[PDB]
Amino acid sequence: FKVGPPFELVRDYCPVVESHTGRTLDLRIIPRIDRGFDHIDEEWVGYKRNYFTLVSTFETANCDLDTFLKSSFDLLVEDSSVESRLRVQYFAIKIKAKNDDDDTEINLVQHTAKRDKGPQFCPSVCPLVPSPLPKHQIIREASNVRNITKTKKYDSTFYLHRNHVNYEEYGVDSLLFSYPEDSIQKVARYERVQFASSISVKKPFQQNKHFSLHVILGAVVDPDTFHGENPGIPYDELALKNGSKGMFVYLQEMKTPPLIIRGRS
Numbered sequence: 336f337k338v339g340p341p342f343e344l345v346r347d348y349c350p351v352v353e354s355h356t357g358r359t360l361d362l363r364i365i366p367r368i369d370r371g372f373d374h375i376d377e378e379w380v381g382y383k384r385n386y387f388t389l390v391s392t393f394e395t396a397n398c399d400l401d402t403f404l405k406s407s408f409d410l411l412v413e414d415s416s417v418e419s420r421l422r423v424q425y426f427a428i429k430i431k432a433k434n435d436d437d438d439t440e441i442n443l444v445q446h447t448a449k450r451d452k453g454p455q456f457c458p459s460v461c462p463l464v465p466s467p468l469p470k471h472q473i474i475r476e477a478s479n480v481r482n483i484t485k486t487k488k489y490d491s492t493f494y495l496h497r498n499h500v501n502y503e504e505y506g507v508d509s510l511l512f513s514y515p516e517d518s519i520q521k522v523a524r525y526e527r528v529q530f531a532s533s534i535s536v537k538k539p540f541q542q543n544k545h546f547s548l549h550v551i552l553g554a555v556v557d558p559d560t561f562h563g564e565n566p567g568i569p570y571d572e573l574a575l576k577n578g579s580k581g582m583f584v585y586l587q588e589m590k591t592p593p594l595i596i597r598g599r600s
Contacts, residue, residue: 338471339368340379342550345588349568351423351554353398354407354508360398364428364589365468366391366550369475371528372594379591383541383598386446386527390474391428391550392466393587400495403465404511405504410554410584412567421566423554424575425514427583428523429460432530435545435593442531448481458525460553460573460583462514464495466521478526495519515576530596539600545593553583 342364351360371387372379381387395403409420432441447453469477469492477484477493484493497517505511532540555573558564558580568584575581 336367336471339370340372340374340591340594342366342589342591345549345590347587348585350411351408351586352411352420354409354422358397360408361394361396362552362587363394363396364391364550364552364587365394366589367468367471367474368548368591369471369478372591379594381594381596383529383596386529388474388478388524388526389430389528389548389550390468390525391430391523392468392521393426393428393463393552394467395465398465400465404495404500405506405509407506407508407510408554410556410566410568410586414567419561419567421554421556421584422560423510423513424557424581425462425510425555426464426586427460427462427553427555427573429551429553429571429583430458430523430525431549431551433547433549433590435547441546442533443525443528444531445525446527446529448527451481458528460571461523462516462519462555463523464514464519464521469493469522474522474524477524493520493522495521541596542598542600543595545595547590547592547594549588549590551585552587553585555581555583557581 352358353360367390369388371385372381408423412419432443434441443458444455445458446455566584570582570584573581573583
């Protein structure tokens with residue numbers, strides 16, 4: 336959006352249809368970097384100690400939340416005129432940073448709030464239900480105030496409480512039940528993020544290199560629900576609720592233009 340670098344589609348990995356009907360579910364990642372990068376002299380510039388904020392949601396233009404939660408979805412995988420269907424357990428977002436020049440990925444590390452004691456931690460894959468991306472100033476409020484997204488005014492904006500949904504209207508095969516927890520986020524929020532240079536390399540490292548932030552929308556599928564372990568599509572491992580090996584299969588991916596980290600040495 337106006338704020339932060341723009342995002343472009345990298346690739347759509349595979350269709351996702353509603354199970355009962357076979358109809359295509361429209362998917363669109365809605366990302367925005369609300370702090371950390373701005374343009375100066377034709378360049379998107381960030382700085383070492385100015386940790387950035389990246390947020391994202393995803394939307395289903397052709398399906399409301401209610402319906403979305405009551406339906407079932409499969410990934411359409413095709414290999415040699417042979418189409419298979421993998422059942423979706425839930426949807427989630429993952430972020431990654433890359434060396435825009437040589438595909439090599441660079442680590443992303445988050446820092447806990449200033450007043451909040453706590454060591455740095457790795458960004459998480461975030462289970463999400465369809466939602467519009469709140470505007471910059473709302474995201475800002477969230478980032479600067481503890482538990483504000485949990486107040487009555489913002490709760491419905493940032494969460495879907497499964498334990499508050501009227502079950503009886505849902506089928507036993509509804510997507511809502513296959514999600515990891517009752518508290519499901521509507522917005523994937525990664526605040527106070529920094530690019531972490533490899534510990535194998537010395538300083539400086541980020542200087543003069545172009546980086547790119549990637550936002551990945553995926554569907555976690557259970558290898559036990561199909562024959563074999565190969566979905567036939569790019570994916571990352573992700574333990575399921577019962578610690579069973581699950582599979583974050585890629586659906587859509589987006590990235591920012593080249594990003595530069597500036598400072599002094």
